[PDB]
Amino acid sequence: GTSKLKYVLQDARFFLIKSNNHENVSLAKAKGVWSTLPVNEKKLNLAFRSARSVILIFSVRESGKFQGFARLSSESHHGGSPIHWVLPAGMSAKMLGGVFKIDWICRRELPFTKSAHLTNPWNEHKPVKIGRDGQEIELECGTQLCLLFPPDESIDLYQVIHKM
């Protein structure tokens, strides 16, 4: 069902995360982690303290799809095991902030064609697929976007509910 999912999303905050390649999303899905530039790291740390759930919705550039969504389980931290991100020409591993732990809620894809009816008030009411890495998505838009994803029957939200 969708009842536990709605419970996790109640009063949540949502952020669009844009990866330049599939490899970084694969790493995030395998290891339960994400690292972003310091400008976004500061926004996510503030959001984590402010809301009962902070949801990252991932999209690989030029893929025409979202690749899933996850909930922050921690603020960012440094000094952990290294993560071999594949970075665009211009981004360096030192330039990345710390590492956030994340719990995946859905590892399934959603094509942009399916979210064409959702606009984001925090990005001039443009379609929700449009946004820079780190763009915040307003509550109602973000909730409806997450509810469009196919259910991921491999995930049990019971443990996520307990972290809240």
Ligand X SMILES: Cc1n[nH]c(N)c1C#N
**Residue ranges that bind ligand X, judged by CB under 6 A:** 9-12, 18-20, 24, 31-33, 35-36, 77, 80-81, 83, 85, 88, 99, 101, 133, 139-140, 143
Nearest approach, Cβ of 82 to ligand X (angstroms)?
A: 7
- Coil vs helix vs strand at 159: helix
Query: What residues have CB less than 8 Å from 162, skipping those under 6 apart?
Result: none
Instruction: Tell the residue number behind the tokens 């196919």, with chain if given.
Output: 150
133 is in an annotated binding site: yes
122 is in an annotated binding site: no
Report the candidate in 95, 102, 41 with the shortest Cα–Cα distance to residue 74.
102
Task: Specify whether the CB–CB gap between 142 and 123 falls below 8 A.
Answer: no
Nearest approach, Cβ of 1 to ligand X (angstroms)?
A: 16
Q: How big is the chain by its Cα radius of gyration, in Å?
A: 15
Task: Specify whether the CB–CB gap between 50 and 13 falls below 8 A.
Answer: yes
Q: Which is nearer to ligand X, 12 or 47 (CB)?
A: 12
Q: Which is nearer to ligand X, 118 or 139 (CB)?
A: 139
Nearest approach, Cβ of 36 to ligand X (angstroms)?
A: 4
Annotated binding site: 18-20, 34-35, 85, 133
